């Protein structure tokens, strides 16, 4: 997916 | 009454196509965008219902919604019936715990929101997540939103939240303490708290300040 991830 | 409304996160177009056709078959409101009317967030997960953290994930918890696994969709298709999505609720994430059950916490803890009596100012800039979305997140978790450092109600406890990465030409995130008597913390504070649906101690997230 293109949706930004926060890790 | 009241109507099921889903959004998806972590899915590929082809996967989305599945949920679309699925939502079409069962008459389920599907949308692009999370709002107060949104009841379920459908997350892409591993076989154990752990996911990646996305804005929709945070907002699905903050709002006390049903954050369930995309495996619900596939498995319902596989059995030609809609299965009980409670059985597929997301358990955790690749960051905060593979089984911290933040979705269940927020869902059951709407009466004792994690940010009660806190005034938060989202002191910009930010990236990958629009300031109004970070602001809505905290609110949904019972926080009070302050636009300006000056707007801090004196007498509640204040908290300035910043993402020091976004600061192009500034070390200015160390100057914040000057313009107001409040704790300064990175966005990871908000995020870690919302995913676990438990308000974190600030100690780890504090940003050094220059007097």
Closest by Cα among B109, A1, A4, B8 to B191: A4
Same domain, B20 and B52: yes
**Tokens matching residue B74:** 């596939």
Does residue A2 sit at the B interface (CB-CB below 8 Å)?
no
Q: How many CA atoms lie within 13 A of B29 on its CB side?
A: 12
Helix (H, G, I), strand (E, B) or coil at A1: coil
A6 contact residues in B (CB cutoff 8 A): 53-55, 58, 95, 128-129, 191
Identify the H or E element spanning B75: helix B71-78
* Strand (E) or helix (H) holding B69: strand B66-69
* Pick from B176, B167, B163: nearest CA to B205: B163
Residue of A nearest to B191 (CA): A6
Q: Which helix (H) or strand (E) holds B25?
A: helix B13-26
CA angle B205, B103, B36 (to 5 degrees): 100
As a residue count, chain A comes to 7
Through-space distance between the first and last CA atoms of chain B, rounded to whole angstroms: 56
Backbone phi and psi for residue B184, each to the nearest 5 degrees, phi listed first: -115, 125
- Of B119, B171, B163, B168, give the one whose Cα is nearest residue B141: B119
Q: Quick one: B138 and B200 in the same domain?
A: yes
**DSSP track, B141-183:** TT-EE-SSGGG-----EEEEEE-GGG-SS--GGGTGGGGSSS-
Same domain, B131 and B193: yes
Q: Is the Cβ of A7 closer than 8 Å to some Cβ of chain B?
A: yes
Give the tokens for residue B34.
């999370």
B168 and B119 both lie in a single domain: yes
- Are B85 and B31 contained in the same domain? yes
Give the structural domain span for B13.
Answer: 1-109
- Please give the Cα distance from B119 to B143 (Å, whole number): 6
Using CA atoms, how far apart are residues B191 and B54, in angstroms rounded to an integer? Answer: 10
What is the tally of structural domains in chain B? 2
Q: Are residues B99 and B30 in the same domain?
A: yes
Do B90 and B156 belong to one domain? no
Q: Which residue of B has its CA nearest to A6?
A: B53
Q: How many CB atoms lie within 10 A of CB B196?
A: 21
Q: In this complex, do B53 and A6 lie within 8 Å of one another by their Cβ atoms?
A: yes
**CATH code where residue B117 lies:** 3.40.50.10190
Which residues in A lie closer than 8 A to residue B62 (C-beta atoms)?
none
* Closest of B64, B68, B81, B92 to residue B9, by C-alpha: B68
Dump the DSSP string for B115-138. TTTEEEE--S--SSS-HHHHHHHH
Q: Rounded CA gap, B148 and B160, in Å?
A: 10
B13 and B85: one domain?
yes
The 10 Å Cβ neighbour count of residue B79 is 9
Same domain, B119 and B104: no
C-alpha distance from A6 to closest chain B C-alpha (Å): 5
Method used to solve the structure: X-ray
User: Which of B94, B109, B124 is the last residue in one of the domains?
Assistant: B109
Model resolution, angstroms: 2.8
Residue B57 shares a structural domain with residue B126: no
């Amino acid at each position: 997916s293109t949706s930004p991830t926060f890790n | 009454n009241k109507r099921m409304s889903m959004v998806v996160s972590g899915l590929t177009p082809e996967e989305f196509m599945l949920v679309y056709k699925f939502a079409r078959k069962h008459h389920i409101t599907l949308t692009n965008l999370i709002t107060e009317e949104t009841t379920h967030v459908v997350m892409k997960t591993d076989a154990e219902f752990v996911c990646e953290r996305t804005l929709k994930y945070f907002l699905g918890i903050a709002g006390g919604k049903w954050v369930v696994s995309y495996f619900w969709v596939t498995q319902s298709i596989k059995e030609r019936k809609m299965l009980n999505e409670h059985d597929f609720e997301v358990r955790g994430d690749v960051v905060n715990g593979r089984n911290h059950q933040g979705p269940k916490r927020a869902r059951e803890s709407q009466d004792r929101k994690i940010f009660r009596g806190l005034e938060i100012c989202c002191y910009g800039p930010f990236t990958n997540m629009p300031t109004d979305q970070l602001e809505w997140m905290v609110q949904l978790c019972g926080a009070s939103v302050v636009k300006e450092l000056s707007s801090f109600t004196l007498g509640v406890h204040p908290i300035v939240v910043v993402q020091p990465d976004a600061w192009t030409e500034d070390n200015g995130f160390h100057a914040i303490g000057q313009m107001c008597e409040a704790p300064v913390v990175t966005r990871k504070w908000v995020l870690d708290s919302v995913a676990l649906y438990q308000c974190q101690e600030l100690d780890t997230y504090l940003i050094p300040q220059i007097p």
